[PDB]
Paper text:
PG assembly requires a glycosyltransferase (GT) to generate a glycan polymer using a Lipid II substrate, which is then crosslinked to the existing PG via a transpeptidase (TP) reaction. In [name], the GT [name] from the Shape, Elongation, Division, and Sporulation (SEDS) family, and [name], the monofunctional TP class B Penicillin Binding Protein, mediate these respective enzymatic tasks. In the periplasm, PG biosynthesis begins with a Lipid II-specific glycosyltransferase (GT) which forms a glycan strand polymer by linking the disaccharides of two Lipid II molecules, one termed the donor and the other the acceptor, and thereby releasing Und-PP from the donor site.
Here, we used single-particle cryo-electron microscopy (cryo-EM) to determine the structure of the [name] [name]-[name] complex, expressed as a functional fusion and reconstituted in lipid-filled nanodiscs, to 3.0 Å resolution. The structure shows ten [name] TM helices, with intracellular N- and C-termini. TM helices 1-6 and TM helices 8–10 form a tight helical bundle, with TM helix 7 extending away from it, stabilized by three periplasmic juxtamembrane helices (PH1, PH2 and PH3). Additionally, the [name] single TM helix, is ordered and packs against [name] TM helices 8 and 9. Analysis of the [name] portion of the structure for putative substrate-binding sites reveals two major cavities (termed cavity A and B). Cavity A is located between TM helices 6, 7 and 9, and is framed on one side by PH1 and on the other by TM helices 5 and 6 and the periplasmic loop (PL3) connecting the two. The region connecting the two cavities has some of the highest degree of conservation in the entire structure. Given their orientation in respect to the TP site of [name], we suggest that cavities A and B are the donor and acceptor sites for the two substrates, respectively. In our cryo-EM map, within the putative donor site there is a lipid-like density, which we tentatively assigned to Und-PP, a product of the GT reaction. Within the highly conserved region between the two cavities and centrally located in periplasmic loop 4 (PL4) is Asp262, previously identified as a catalytic residue15,17,29.
Author numbering:
A (entry chain B): 9 to 93, 109 to 364
B (entry chain C): 388 to 721, 779 to 808, 835 to 918, 947 to 990
The structure:
């Protein structure tokens, strides 16, 4: 009963430490043996651990109580950043909107009320998605899906989901016939097909595919030490760090990384299903599902199937904001897990 | 409680969804790197598999007769990788000792050493001679990473003949790179280094360029394609067939010489522009093969202003050339004349196949020679409007398709005698003693300070219409005699 006293989850902390060590080694490989970048990455990891532990202390009831204020300040500062033409606060958005959504759900009937509550939640969503999509679309998808998972887990009626799916699937062909004007549809095809149009947007994706094919076999390919050819694709240490991982570790490295990511997701959902109050029941689920969205979006990026989108791989890359926000999510999850009654 | 079970079910569904997505990703990777195992096929680590762009064979510009106008030869260059050279200075000295490399070339290399994005090719020498290529080939092994490569640089066999009309292709700088980024065209332009800055090379830049190829070639040391695996064929630029008569172009230029000026001969029947001429016509090969700052500056400040294509950029007052059109407007209307001229084409882009065209001003007066050509075309056609297009045809499945004129509201009514009145007036001016141009076409067996003049020889069913300007009076005889032998040569 020591970890609970510290308000930390041993299993999540251990898996996250293993994944952080693996990320450190991968960055060493992908940094060109750069001492400064490795020092900065270790500093970012330490800051992430500290913020995770700090966030794991404040009780979930405080999270529910302050969710309205955090959401309000986040929306105000997103309106600010969208205005004036500082630090990109989308991380605050994707850690805040699930909180506000979970609070609003918790303050209503057990399953959400059709077009009485779900409409309110989606209306909370739309300003956030609009503000986080006006500058760029990448983080907007994450911001939406993160709390759409909260709504889905809250008990959103399958009737509404099916109706929406049917309506969108009926509107797409109409968009595919009446709104198929030549250059709009051509641009849509270009965006949808990354590997297409080489030498441009698809240039780096094709280089990444060549990288993953080369030394990507289950035979581990060439191992570690930057014994690779991965400066063909720039920013090999931030976005295509998965390309570096593949080319320098084979298929086994990718499988191990994905196994760690799925283990983290399973533990998070397992402790979310045990949360007493519905707010913490759905918040942890939303956080874990958005983490998997990160993983899948980035791996599809590098393997060359999803459109072009700037979603850094979770906590295995160079960059603090994404690391610290994921760590804060994990801290919220552990607080929910340990505070219990 | 109910909520616990509901959340458990919804979380299980989401977990199954993410498991399916993970399966999708793993299947992608297995297909991409396991089944597609030959993506490396690299026995020696030093080899790469860089995705080499394939520049397409730029469309060869022909003319009416069909002879080539601008060609594409293989010019050789000295290439090396900055990041795979043991000693830059020793290698540069060795180049100086084998290919007589000049210190100015060293300075240019150093300028580009930083300018050119790192981790890529860097050129040092241009217009490499055959003897130098042979020397490098026989002593190639004595250099760390230097390799000679031949790159198709647009050749203009007639050179100063058609430079403003055909255009020139010059190096892509950062401004062009960002301009193409705005249009998302870097994909189709990665291979090519020289891109049209004017002439037909620009307006039909996309037509004459076409889709650029690419290839995944496993290159060993010295950057040699040895294990080409995947390669989309490059869509060779469609060979535009201009409405040009190169013989007429040469004749006009030869009879022009120093006289600065521009000549826009045309053919009202088909709408083409038989001869587009500009006097200075700086040599185009200078721009293609790494024009230096000194020569470019000399051209820019040159009093003759060779960089100005007088056919389009030349915005000059038509003076008396507008009299037929004002007469037609008056006969068709018993500042409305401004609207009538705008309908004719003055004051607006003529649709000519030259993106570098200055529209000019329509006072409510400067009109380019092609604008006068369009006005005369409309005059010949009794109001039917034809764009002064230079593209007679292009390359297609059938390898030839005539240029289709975009119909637009014809001015006035065709079945009106007003147009014939203007034609008869011009014919009388050209073939009557009271007329000023009579002395220049009296002996024609067939009826026919800047100094401009426009006319059409075959009054009955005209087949050639001309409008040209003699800048600052040129240096030869009066423009009338010039057009006289121009017409004489046009149909003998």
């Amino acid at each position: 009963t020591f970890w609970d006293k510290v308000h930390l989850d041993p299993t999540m902390l251990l898996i996250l430490l293993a994944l952080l060590v693996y990320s450190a080694l991968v960055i060493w490989s992908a940094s060109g043996q750069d001492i400064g970048m490795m020092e900065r990455k270790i500093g970012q990891i330490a800051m992430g651990l500290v913020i995770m532990v700090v966030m794991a202390q404040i009780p979930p009831r405080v999270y529910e109580g302050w969710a309205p204020y955090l959401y309000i300040i986040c929306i105000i500062l997103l309106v600010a950043v969208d205005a004036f033409g500082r630090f990109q606060p989308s991380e605050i958005a994707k850690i805040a909107v699930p909180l506000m959504v979970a609070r609003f759900i918790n303050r209503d009937v057990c399953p959400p009320s059709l077009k009485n509550t779900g409409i309110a939640l989606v209306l909370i969503f739309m300003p956030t998605l609009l503000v986080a999509a006006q500058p760029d679309l990448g983080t907007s998808i994450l911001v939406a899906l993160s709390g759409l998972f909260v709504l889905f887990l809250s008990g959103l009626s399958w009737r509404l989901i099916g109706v929406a799916v049917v309506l969108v699937a009926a509107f797409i062909p109409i968009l595919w016939f009446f709104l198929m004007h030549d250059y709009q549809r051509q641009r849509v095809m270009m965006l949808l097909d990354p590997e297409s149009d080489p030498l441009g947007a698809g240039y780096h994706i094709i280089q990444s595919k060549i990288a993953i094919g080369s030394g990507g076999l289950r035979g581990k390919g060439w191992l570690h030490g930057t014994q690779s050819q991965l400066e063909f694709l720039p920013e090999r240490h931030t976005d295509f760090i998965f390309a570096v991982l593949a080319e320098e570790l084979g298929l086994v490295g990718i499988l191990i990384l994905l196994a760690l990511y799925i283990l983290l997701i399973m533990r998070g959902l397992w402790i979310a299903a045990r949360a007493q109050t519905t707010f913490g029941r759905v918040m942890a689920g939303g956080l874990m599902l958005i983490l998997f969205v990160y993983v899948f979006v980035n791996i599809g990026m590098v393997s060359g199937i999803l459109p072009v989108v700037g979603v850094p791989l979770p906590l295995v890359s160079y960059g603090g904001s994404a690391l610290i926000v994921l760590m804060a999510g994990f801290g919220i999850v552990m607080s929910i897990h340990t505070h219990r009654k | 409680t109910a909520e616990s079970a509901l959340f458990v079910r919804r979380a299980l569904v989401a977990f199954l969804g993410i498991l399916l997505l993970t399966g999708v990703l793993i299947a992608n990777l297995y297909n991409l790197q396991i089944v597609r195992f030959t993506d490396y096929q690299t026995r020696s680590n030093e080899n790469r598999i860089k995705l080499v762009p394939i520049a397409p064979s730029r469309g060869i510009i022909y003319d009416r007769n069909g002879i080539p106008l601008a060609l594409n030869r293989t010019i050789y260059q000295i290439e090396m990788m900055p990041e795979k050279v043991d000693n830059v200075q020793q290698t540069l000295d060795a180049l100086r000792s084998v290919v007589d490399l000049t210190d100015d070339d060293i300075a240019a290399f150093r300028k580009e050493r930083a300018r050119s994005h790192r981790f890529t090719s860097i050129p040092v020498k241009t217009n490499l001679t055959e003897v130098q290529v042979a020397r490098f080939a026989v002593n190639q092994y004595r250099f760390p990473g230097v390799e000679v490569k031949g790159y198709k640089r647009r050749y203009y066999p007639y050179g100063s003949a058609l430079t403003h009309v055909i255009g020139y292709v010059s190096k892509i700088n950062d401004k062009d790179v960002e301009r193409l980024n705005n249009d998302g065209k870097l994909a189709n332009y990665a291979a090519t280094h020289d891109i049209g800055k004017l002439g037909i090379e620009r307006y039909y830049e996309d037509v004459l360029h076409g889709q650029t190829g690419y290839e995944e070639v496993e290159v060993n040391n010295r950057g040699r394609v040895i294990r080409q695996l995947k390669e989309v064929p490059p869509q060779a630029g469609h060979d535009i067939y201009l409405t040009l008569d190169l013989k007429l172009q040469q004749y006009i230029e030869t009879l022009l010489a120093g006289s600065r000026a521009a000549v826009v001969v045309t053919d009202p029947r088909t709408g083409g522009v038989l001869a587009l001429v500009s006097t200075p016509s700086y040599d185009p090969n200078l721009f293609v093969d790494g024009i230096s700052s000194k020569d470019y500056s000399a051209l820019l400040n040159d009093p003759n202003t060779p960089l100005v294509n007088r056919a389009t950029q030349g915005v000059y007052p038509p003076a008396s050339t507008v009299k037929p059109y004002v007469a037609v407007s008056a006969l068709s209307a018993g500042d409305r004349l401004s609207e009538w001229m705008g309908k004719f084409g003055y004051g607006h882009y003529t649709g000519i196949d030259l993106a570098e065209e200055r529209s000019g001003n329509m006072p409510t007066w400067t009109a380019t020679p092609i604008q006068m050509s369009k006005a005369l075309m409309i005059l010949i056609n009794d109001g039917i409007v034809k764009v002064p297009h230079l593209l007679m045809s292009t390359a297609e499945d059938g390898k030839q398709v005539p240029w289709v004129q975009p119909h637009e509201p014809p001015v006035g009514d065709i079945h009106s005698g007003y147009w014939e009145l203007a034609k008869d007036g011009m014919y009388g001016v050209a073939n009557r003693p009271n007329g000023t141009a009579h002395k220049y076409f009296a002996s024609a067996p067939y009826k026919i300070d800047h100094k401009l003049m426009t006319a059409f020889a075959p009054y009955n069913n005209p087949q050639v219409a001309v409008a040209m300007i003699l800048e600052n009076g040129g240096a030869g005889p009066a423009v009338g005699t010039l057009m006289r032998q121009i017409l004489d040569h046009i149909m003998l």
